[PDB]
Amino acid sequence: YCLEDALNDLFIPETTIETILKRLTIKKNIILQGPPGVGKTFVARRLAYLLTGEKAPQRVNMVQFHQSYSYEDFIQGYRPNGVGFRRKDGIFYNFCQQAKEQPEKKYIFIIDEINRANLSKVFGEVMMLMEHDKRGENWSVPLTYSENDEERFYVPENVYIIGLMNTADRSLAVVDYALRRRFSFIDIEPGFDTPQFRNFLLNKKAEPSFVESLCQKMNELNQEISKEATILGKGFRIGHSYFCCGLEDGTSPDTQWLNEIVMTDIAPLLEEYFFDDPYKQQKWTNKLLG
Amino acid sequence: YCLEDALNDLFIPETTIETILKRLTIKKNIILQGPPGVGKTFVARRLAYLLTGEKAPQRVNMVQFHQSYSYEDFIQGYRPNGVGFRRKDGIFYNFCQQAKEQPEKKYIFIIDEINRANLSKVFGEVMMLMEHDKRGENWSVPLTYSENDEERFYVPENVYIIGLMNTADRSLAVVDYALRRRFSFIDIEPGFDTPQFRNFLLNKKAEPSFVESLCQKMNELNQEISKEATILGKGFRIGHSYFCCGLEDGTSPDTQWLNEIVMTDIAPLLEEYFFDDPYKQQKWTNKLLG
Amino acid sequence: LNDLFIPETTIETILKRLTIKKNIILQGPPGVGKTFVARRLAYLLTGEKAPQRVNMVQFHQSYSYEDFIQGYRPNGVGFRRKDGIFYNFCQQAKEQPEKKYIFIIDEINRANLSKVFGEVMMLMEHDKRGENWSVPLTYSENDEERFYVPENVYIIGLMNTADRSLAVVDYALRRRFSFIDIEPGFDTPQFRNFLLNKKAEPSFVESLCQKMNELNQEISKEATILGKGFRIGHSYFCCGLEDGTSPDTQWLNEIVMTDIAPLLEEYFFDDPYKQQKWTNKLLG
Amino acid sequence: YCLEDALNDLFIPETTIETILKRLTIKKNIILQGPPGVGKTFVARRLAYLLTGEKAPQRVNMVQFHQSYSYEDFIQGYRPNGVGFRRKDGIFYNFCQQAKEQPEKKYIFIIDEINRANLSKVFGEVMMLMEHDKRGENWSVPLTYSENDEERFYVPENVYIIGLMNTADRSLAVVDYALRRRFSFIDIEPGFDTPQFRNFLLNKKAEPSFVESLCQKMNELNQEISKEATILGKGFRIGHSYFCCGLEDGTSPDTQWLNEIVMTDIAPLLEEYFFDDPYKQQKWTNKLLG
Amino acid sequence: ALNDLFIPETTIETILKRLTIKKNIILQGPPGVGKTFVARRLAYLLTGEKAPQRVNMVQFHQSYSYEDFIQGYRPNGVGFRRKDGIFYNFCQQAKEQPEKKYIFIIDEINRANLSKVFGEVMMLMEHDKRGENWSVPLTYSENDEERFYVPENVYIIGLMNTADRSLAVVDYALRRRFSFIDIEPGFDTPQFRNFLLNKKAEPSFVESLCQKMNELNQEISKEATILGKGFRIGHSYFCCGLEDGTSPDTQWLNEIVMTDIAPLLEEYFFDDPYKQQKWTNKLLG
Amino acid sequence: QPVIPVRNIYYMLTYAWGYANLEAIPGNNLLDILGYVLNKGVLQLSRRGLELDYNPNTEIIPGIKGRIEFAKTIRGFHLNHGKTVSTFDMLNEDTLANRIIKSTLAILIKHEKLNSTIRDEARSLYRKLPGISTLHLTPQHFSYLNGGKNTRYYKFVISVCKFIVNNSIPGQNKGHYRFYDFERNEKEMSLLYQKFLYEFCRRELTSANTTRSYLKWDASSISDQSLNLLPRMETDITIRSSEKILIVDAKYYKSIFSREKFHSQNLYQLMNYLWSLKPENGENIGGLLIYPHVDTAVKHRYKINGFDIGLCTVNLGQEWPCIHQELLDIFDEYLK
Ligand SMILES: Nc1nc2c(ncn2[C@@H]2O[C@H](COP(=O)(O)OP(=O)(O)NP(=O)(O)O)[C@@H](O)[C@H]2O)c(=O)[nH]1
Ligand SMILES: Nc1nc2c(ncn2[C@@H]2O[C@H](COP(=O)(O)OP(=O)(O)NP(=O)(O)O)[C@@H](O)[C@H]2O)c(=O)[nH]1
Ligand SMILES: Nc1nc2c(ncn2[C@@H]2O[C@H](COP(=O)(O)OP(=O)(O)NP(=O)(O)O)[C@@H](O)[C@H]2O)c(=O)[nH]1
Ligand SMILES: Nc1nc2c(ncn2[C@@H]2O[C@H](COP(=O)(O)OP(=O)(O)O)[C@@H](O)[C@H]2O)c(=O)[nH]1
Ligand SMILES: Nc1nc2c(ncn2[C@@H]2O[C@H](COP(=O)(O)OP(=O)(O)O)[C@@H](O)[C@H]2O)c(=O)[nH]1
Ligand SMILES: [Mg+2]
Ligand SMILES: [Mg+2]
Ligand SMILES: [Mg+2]
Incomplete structure (x- = not known):
């Protein structure tokens, strides 16, 4: 896979596409903010194959936040088993463990309409760890529902996160300025x-x-x-x-x-x-x- | 079923009905907006049998939204069997499984008074999936309550969604413009x-x-x-x-x-x-x- | 029809309107015998003083769809789906189609009437009563099991006109209900x-x-x-x-x-x- | 652990870090209050090794607070087994017990994004013990979930608490009452x-x-x-x-x-x-x- | 326990008359005036004995609950067991010795919600409605006959911090019963x-x-x-x-x-x- | 002590806020006018429907509502007494915007000097909104609502609510309130005038383009490139058209209301704006001084330093339409 294949049909300039990879590779967390209908969801699946360099779905994960996502859903939560409750590893926690299986090949987690959910509630511990600098075993942290035996969860370096926040609903806009520094915001034109x-x-x-x-x-x-x-x-x-x-x-x-x-x-x-x-x-x- | 069966008692012109069926085959999601008392509920069951062409109610599900309706009831959620809770595949999820069995035959979901419930909260993951060009396994998404990333839910191509929303109340309007794009809005007059x-x-x-x-x-x-x-x-x-x-x-x-x-x-x-x-x-x- | 202080014409209007339309709202200030008319009136429409058919409830702001129709509530062992009164009441008339069963809702204005009724806000209309228009409920595990209003059921609404709430106006519900004023x-x-x-x-x-x-x-x-x-x-x-x-x-x-x-x-x-x-x- | 390695790279004046170390030995409950991107998280990891004088991970522990964080995970609580409920010693409880063994050696507990969760909900009973004056076995208390009154928990004097709070949100105008009395605020300049x-x-x-x-x-x-x-x-x-x-x-x-x-x-x-x-x-x- | 208290002698004496009458005082004031210290020493003075056991002190917070205070159902190894609280247990000791005076210290009472914590008992703890006559079955009581009654010996002291700007209005339920007392620095x-x-x-x-x-x-x-x-x-x-x-x-x-x-x-x-x-x-x- | 008739200010406030019959009311004073707008304004909304925002609610109930929070349930052991902690979206009208309306109405009633009918009618409304909770209003409350999710109509009445609270002073009694004498102070009246024109010109002068323009001094200093000490200079308005540009400076002065000496100190600011501004287009450069007068309007033109400058007035107190005609007449002369 290569840039020529993806950029055949895209209506966005190459300029932003290089701007994305420039900001992405240094910072590792970005946001594309634009009104609906500019290919925000459309570009996102294409970009993932670029960084991996191949058309692989396994290294990519795609989700949407629905104003009912919870820390129990993303990371660590308790689910009923047949008779009694159990602890369930969330999806992102499930994703990172695969991602750290090989640092070489990049892994992508994609969140559509991210602005909706109360992101501080969803990420919880992760809000600090997502940053490019604070990754790896150096910044290992124990989670809320982790076992008393010390076991720690750290964002791997290979992971890159992309969020897709529409700019129409003003109320549903990121006002967590502490969080808005973790991400880099890329305006997209019509x-x-x-x-x-x-x-x-x-x-x-x-x-x-x-x-x-x-x-x-x-x-x-x-x-x-x-x-x-x-x-x-x-x-x-x-x-x-x-x-x-x-x-x-x-x-x-x-x-x-x-x-x-x-x-x-x-x-x-x-x-x-x-x-x-x-x-x-x-x-x-x-x-x-x- | 036949076309002329409906038109005998129907007060709306055929031209709008032709506009309706043309869009719906293309867009696959529509909203009928007008005052109460013009047969939105009346046409909706009729129109479904036209689009399928056959008088099959098994393939049609008709629901009325309201404030106390959520993703847990609609799509997926944890509910009590009894002593032990279980993950309960909601009504829309079950409907999609039935349509998957028969891709050729069109299956239709009719929502009365859609404007009331918080649609962003209710559909959630579906809000992206429902788009006419994003249907299929390529865009399959893991849900909130899915055990792993591998378990993924995708809207079938055959599915058509019809929305009924009165315009008497300005408080309750579908102001979420991204959601407004998915639905092709068809005005109806008395x-x-x-x-x-x-x-x-x-x-x-x-x-x-x-x-x-x-x-x-x-x-x-x-x-x-x-x-x-x-x-x-x-x-x-x-x-x-x-x-x-x-x-x-x-x-x-x-x-x-x-x-x-x-x-x-x-x-x-x-x-x-x-x-x-x-x-x-x-x-x-x-x-x-x- | 003897001790009632309201004209024979209004009740004569009401009975034809109720029999035709099947839903009505009796709106007037407090102290005009809205309750006594409806209790008397249901016995007239049935023709016999049978109280089991008639059930009365008094809404209030905290009343919810959980209480009225369906809802999840605890038994001794745990939680279960508990059929609310109206689902239970419609089944009662569904058991006996011939007779006319009546449901009275007092202090209707207070609650968000849309919220409680929900699914039946469409179904309650006289034409859309029967299995053909049945729908699966919110809490129904499977689409196959559905709820439909029977034809015999009639609903009467008693509303206080002295406490208007400029919060939610629904003109669609007004289509369902035929409104009748009552003078003192x-x-x-x-x-x-x-x-x-x-x-x-x-x-x-x-x-x-x-x-x-x-x-x-x-x-x-x-x-x-x-x-x-x-x-x-x-x-x-x-x-x-x-x-x-x-x-x-x-x-x-x-x-x-x-x-x-x-x-x-x-x-x-x-x-x-x-x-x-x-x-x-x-x-x- | 030489200061020269630690403090050279840092942008903050050597004046403020000295005052930070002064009050921290004195009161042991300290808060760094500044906007995001001034190295609040950066300094705090270094300061722990300064005070201990050595690079040891065991003596220093790091956590980030969020709405889901609770007393039951932080201090003590019951975690479901397959059916049964087993009590679990929490992090802060487990961390002090290590600090109890070595009273001479300084121990540090690092709490990021502290305002997001109310301290009372997490700490609760321990806000009495956490204070600098009311430390040691003299002030020992039996815990809420303790099986008997005999078992008691006291904050050993050795532990020092650092809390990282960002003045970037509108909610923080009403700073939590617990923080002001029990922690000593320090402002970090850009x-x-x-x-x-x-x-x-x-x-x-x-x-x-x-x-x-x-x-x-x-x-x-x-x-x-x-x-x-x-x-x-x-x-x-x-x-x-x-x-x-x-x-x-x-x-x-x-x-x-x-x-x-x-x-x-x-x-x-x-x-x-x-x-x-x-x-x-x-x-x-x-x-x-x- | 009265050798050197920075507070004037009048106020500490006035409280003793007030407490023996009303039995429920709130001490307001800035932090750092020994609100616990003046209250702690006063407890020994009212008894006249410098004994800690009769006195008990707890710090209230918003998440402080009826379950901790009075009765709750914590799990044992297998199944849930009712667990007596502080105040419930506290009274059982005071009932033994009605002649003696027992005192309960409640720090930061305004911070927590009194009603959710006390629940049923808020009626009884008032000085008048005390003794066996006003005994009521508790919320968790399996048997109606077992009841809880506030003995007269118990005296309740509350410490409230005036300093906080976040404070706007005192709880209504608090004001009806307690006699607020202001301590100058x-x-x-x-x-x-x-x-x-x-x-x-x-x-x-x-x-x-x-x-x-x-x-x-x-x-x-x-x-x-x-x-x-x-x-x-x-x-x-x-x-x-x-x-x-x-x-x-x-x-x-x-x-x-x-x-x-x-x-x-x-x-x-x-x-x-x-x-x-x-x-x-x-x-x- | 001559001032403008109070009704006309409301029209200028409308353009100031950027969005009816006032002849009916007999109370000339402002609060009578302003309250009647609001008192009718609330009722206009209720016809269409007030804003209902889904507020998620996490509470302890005896059953399943929406999404159950498994953690808080097991940690508190609420299953045993047949309860769960579940998240659901009760739909209320208790939003910040609607709370502000109700709190504002309380203030409106408490005002000691007010038409009785206005006070009578509003007291009905306060009762008619039982669910909403009273609040103690501050500008910070209005600050949170700058997001402007609400409809276009809501923003008008809220702007009124902003005006009333700020211009409310306690009077004879502790509880009651007394209205500010807004007209007497020049600065707020002047600041209204400058903002009144800026939004007004966008409406009517579709022909020209209307923008506020920041200007930079031509200076350079060896000391500092910043030049922070120098006065910050931002135009009141610039109304640029292809044939001609034009800068306007407008202010409200009491001395000019007297028909003697003239207060034109603002002119000193103007030339430096013309000087520091350099047009790439180079079509022309013109300036305008416009002030409010009560009795009559007079227009003059000047040729000062290579610039074509006009000093002009408007006869406020005449009538709103002729005033609207007069302003379009005014800009027509100079914009050429
Ligand atoms: N062929 C082609 N289609 C494009 C291009 N850009 C956008 N589209 C199309 O526009 C539609 C929606 O794109 P999408 O990514 O979902 O926009 P979005 O911002 O994610 N939508 P929303 O904001 O509503 O969630 C799709 O048909 C998509 O393929 C483009 O450059 N080329
Ligand atoms: N016979 C006949 N009845 C019609 C026709 N069109 C509408 N109606 C009648 O008008 C009534 C309401 O139909 P409905 O779809 O529910 O109107 P609505 O706009 O959806 N009402 P609401 O929005 O309040 O739910 C029924 O009596 C329906 O049969 C028609 O073409 N023929
Ligand atoms: N080399 C160097 N890096 C610094 C210095 N100060 C901050 N940084 C860098 O700034 C980045 C973030 O610092 P951080 O402590 O996380 O800021 P924060 O206060 O924790 N952020 P937040 O408030 O959002 O949680 C890291 O790369 C950190 O090393 C400094 O003085 N020298
Ligand atoms: N005989 C007779 N009694 C009436 C009449 N209207 C009301 N009442 C009685 O007044 C009492 C209170 O009526 P109530 O329903 O509570 O008043 P409302 O609900 O506000 O209309 C009952 O005994 C009613 O039967 C009437 O018209 N005739
Ligand atoms: N000897 C003496 N000690 C006092 C006096 N006032 C306060 N103290 C001491 O001051 C310390 C703090 O008291 P306290 O007010 O309870 O702390 P707070 O929780 O911060 O309010 C304790 O050692 C008190 O006993 C006093 O008047 N005399
Ligand atoms: Mg999209
Ligand atoms: Mg209808
Ligand atoms: Mg940080």
Whole structure:
């Protein structure tokens, strides 16, 4: 596996991709913050094969935090057995033990929509240990539910962690500033401007004028969205995922297809987004169709 | 089952239904938003048999969400068998196992009053999995309560999810915009001014003048309601069900019948919609009767 | 139909409305005999004074879906799934389809009505009653076992209109429920005939209605703050005179200071002078 | 364990470490209160070997507190067997018992992220014993879960307790009452304007002018944050550890290396800080890049 | 146990009348006035015997529970066993000797929730509703006939710390029953001085020290709404540390100034250090 | 002692907060106006529905609700008395935003000088919200709500709640409150004016682009590159258009209200803003001084140091629409 294979279809620039591996390899914990529809989940599976250098799923682990994840789930917890309770090794604890089987080959743990859960509750002991510096046997620590016999749990050096926090829900935003220093935050753009986005459409039977018209209108809208910060901040700006999918059968992109998108998905989104005057809704809706 | 079986009694136009079935085959997740009393519950069981094309209720599961509903009940969670607790595969998990057995046949899950329960908390792991392009074993994910990383849960491709969410309550709205992207939102209108609703009335020995007078009356009223979008959007407007049922006996729809229902149902509603204006209540109430 | 102080027309409206729609809310201020109407009314609809069919409950803010329908609660050995009353009650009518079984919910406004009812908030509708519309419950282990409202079941809701909560308004539930107002009924002869058949003075009764109605009109004057929903009920007068104490102004004077004055205080809060006026106006 | 190895690398003045050692011998219950990235965790591991005078792991123990941490794990509690419940001596109980054997040798217990769990919930009864005056067998107490009153637990005088607390969260405005009385707070400065931090930078092939230019900015920026009290106090200010990292390769400091750090760590942190004033973000970010 | 207490004689005598009547006192006040010490010695005085067993002391915290206090079901090797608490057991001893006076000391009572801990017994512990007549079956009692009654001999002392800013309002349940008592720091008193005079302290150092703390304590009490009077520093630091026969002098004093008093000033004065240094200077300068 | 009619300030506050009939109310004073907005504002929300935030609850109950916490259950041995510690999401209206409304209403009633009907109507609302718990309000409470998850409508009434509490002073009685004389102080009224325009111009002047611009001194000093001692300079507003740029400095002074000497000390700031600002576009550079006057509005133009500068006034107290017309008339002249 290599960069050329992954980056064939991605609409994100190479620039960020190098920025990721630059920040990742030094720091080992990163966050990609962007609105939905920019391929956050999409890139993450591809990146894992790069660092390992091979397309292997075993060295990768993927999860989503659902505002009910707990330290009992991630690390160490007690589960019913048939008649009586037992202690169960969590998933991350299960993952690290495999990861330290070989330091040579890198192991990745991927958490989608990480911002939701109360991360201090989930990680507990791990919040310190995740950092690049504080890894290995030097910083071994005994866990809460560890046996009285001293047995210690340390983050292996080979492990790299990636989190995928959407920036739309403001309430569900990381306010644990102690934790926000452990991670490095990578802003991801909607991906309209790139030709690599455009070429995908032209390859799929698209007019350059219709294509260039499309990006022109979205960029105007996102600026109007980006202008506000009171309610709708920079992060709220619309992703490109809506346009990406559904054309595999041979349906060529045209104003009919775009009009279906505008009426069906985005226009409901806009009225929820604004919810002050319809005229602003009527304005931008007609603009896209025009 | 057949298409024409449904359309005989259905007040909604076929065009929306064609829009519904086109999106649903593509997106596989949808939300129907409108005021109460327009047949969201009515269509949903009908539409499922259309999409499958066969009248199979075994393949359809219908549920109504509420505040006291959680991932433990829905997907997976630990619950008491008796003396000993067990991991109880929830309703949605069981539904997916059935659909996995028969990938060809479409299996449908219908959620009434979806907007109430905290969907982020309820679906959780599913929130990523449900996407139309991420279904399959490639995106299989280990759950919170899974014994190991190897045990993983993936949505089948055949699954279609249908959402029913009233727009009368702005407090309860699906503001989680990432979740909003997964569902393709299909507005529904009361559809008073349609032939199929009137033909049902005329079939019940009704005056064409009274019927056409009736449709004109509400159309003006709904537009008045839609005007004050800051106060009341289109989502609050009156549904058609008040008029639909109650004629099963064979009672002809005279003006007296209308006068009874308006006094009992719509009259207090207008008082609440217009708390401040007593005159405005009197205006529209008297306008229908005269 | 004899000792009831509410018009025959309203109950005649109700019985047709209930039989057709199968769900109703009887909304009015406290002391108008909401409970007595419903208890009487269920016996009318059944036609026999059978109490086993009729069950009454009084909601409160802490009531939950765990209590009403299903819920996990402990036996001596441990925890189990405990079928709530309504599931138990619907099974009772499901045992006997022919007869009409009734369920009464008092103090309905207080609780989050959506929260308790939950699944049945759809099912309760008269058309969607039967196995066809059955659904698996929240706590049901398997989808196959489902719950469906029977056709015989009828629900009556009793609501206090004097404590509005501007917390949650549901207009969808309002579609399920056919709302019927209840007036206090001082003007009605049937209330007066009871008292005139209790050795009341004719003038004493007639002047009283003038006194109370003027108070009721003032409460309905300012629609935003108060309304017909707040105004005074009659039921305080019914009880306390069956011992044998015939009506007199002294008897009324007990009730005014005993009962009505806090209500007046509650309604005309931070306005003692209005209390002194309207309190004293009645006594003369 | 020579001071020269320990204290040379450290950025903190030799003045403050001396005072830290003074009160620590005196009171034995000490708290280092500072923002993340000032080496609070870094110094604490070294200080233990300073006091003991030797590199021994057994005499020093480290833990991180979190919401799940409890009395039953920390001190004493019952862990389920296959069915039965067996009492278990906890860490702090087990650690002191080792310290009981060797009263002369100094023993250290290190507690990171102490504010996250309430001390009463974990320590509980021991807050009486933990205090410096009420130590020794004279003040021995029988424990909550002790089988008989005869068994007793007393904090030997030798143990010293260090607690690492970060002033980065809004909740910590209401500092726990237990901490203030029983622990002695010490404030850790960010410590940019130090020779040793600079001398560290210069030693890694860094221009002095570029280094001194940076120090003016960080001292300038932290002043702006520290001036505020409503939203961001003095305790919220940036630490000195973003800049320490990333130099193991030998890559010389420059605007290129700096630009990665600002954009990927400090810029989005400022977005969270100065949410209300986006332009203030641009005001500082451009200033730092220069 | 009454030889040298820095507190004035009036208050310690007033409490004894108050305690024999009300039987439930709360001692407020700043930390470092020997709240336990004054309370501990008073317990021996009310009995008149310097005996520890009749006296018991426990420190309350928010996680302190009814299970620890009264009755709980801790597991033995095989199965759960009811375990008597402190107060429950404590009364069993006092019931033996009704003639004698038994005393229960409760530190940091406001911090914990009284109701969850005491539960049923909060009614009985009031002075009136005492004796066999008011006996009630306990919550965990398997048999109704076995009951718990508060004997008259028991006297309850509570220590509450005024200093904490986090404190806003006293618990209602606490206020109805207990008689709050305020202890001044008593930094300017003869008995405190006479102890210091017995140690090698000249009158000027005494007058210098007593004068300076009065001025500083006056500042804290002066800003009453901003800071409670109970914020003012106590005297216990000056008591301890001189047992070795060390002479108290300005050289010795400056250690305590910087070590104990300075962080307390830092905590109390969280706004302006410029104000703090002004007051630290006067203590020594 | 001449001042603006109180009703007009509310319009400027609206643009200051960035988002109705006021003719009905007969009380000219502010709190009568402000309370009626809130008192109606609360009722407007309830029609649509108030915010309900799922608060997770971990409590000791006799049964299964949501997710059981196995650890706290076994550690406390709650199984034996038939109880579990379980996490579930009760849905309340007790959020910080809604608590603030109820606490604000308590303050509103306690104000000694207020319309009686306003006080009567609000007391109803306080009773109508039983679940919500009263709180003692501080700005720090409002600080936590800067996240702004809430709807757009909520932010308006909360801004009112911010204004009332800060501008509330105890008066005759310990319990009751008395309203601040906001108009008399120039600084807060002036700070309103500067913010009033900045958000206002974004609304109406769609033609031009409106931004606050930080400016940097042209100076260099051998002593320090920082130049911290130098005054920090940030424009009140800059309203840039392709044909012409324009900087405005606006302030409220009492001396100008008298129709004599003129207070234009702010002008001294202005030239240095023109000087330190250098446009790459180089289309033009213009400046504006705008002040509030009561009686009448007068516009002048100047050619000072190669700059085209205007001093102008607005007749506040006339009427809001003509004022809105007047402002659009104003910027039209100079923006050219
Ligand atoms: N072909 C192609 N598809 C892309 C690209 N970027 C995003 N997409 C598509 O957009 C859809 C969603 O991408 P995804 O990673 O899930 O975005 P997300 O941020 O994780 N979603 P969310 O924030 O809602 O959780 C998928 O169809 C994904 O493949 C791209 O560069 N090329
Ligand atoms: N006969 C007939 N009835 C219809 C038709 N459409 C809707 N209805 C009736 O309107 C009522 C409600 O249907 P429903 O789907 O539950 O409406 P809703 O919008 O989901 N209501 P809610 O949101 O409150 O649950 C039923 O009486 C239903 O049969 C129709 O086309 N024909
Ligand atoms: N070489 C060197 N590294 C330092 C110095 N100070 C801090 N660091 C480095 O900064 C990084 C983090 O330090 P740390 O103690 O964990 O900060 P913290 O206070 O514990 N962080 P937090 O508050 O978030 O828990 C480590 O690489 C640490 O060695 C120092 O003076 N010299
Ligand atoms: N005879 C007769 N009794 C009535 C009538 N209304 C109420 N009562 C009696 O008043 C008493 C209290 O009624 P209650 O249900 O508590 O008042 P409500 O619930 O507020 O309507 C009962 O004895 C009722 O039967 C009535 O109309 N006729
Ligand atoms: N001899 C004597 N000792 C005192 C006096 N006051 C306090 N002490 C001692 O001061 C020390 C601390 O007492 P205490 O207030 O209980 O500590 P706290 O828990 O921090 O409040 C103990 O040794 C007390 O006995 C006093 O007036 N006379
Ligand atoms: Mg995604
Ligand atoms: Mg429906
Ligand atoms: Mg740390």
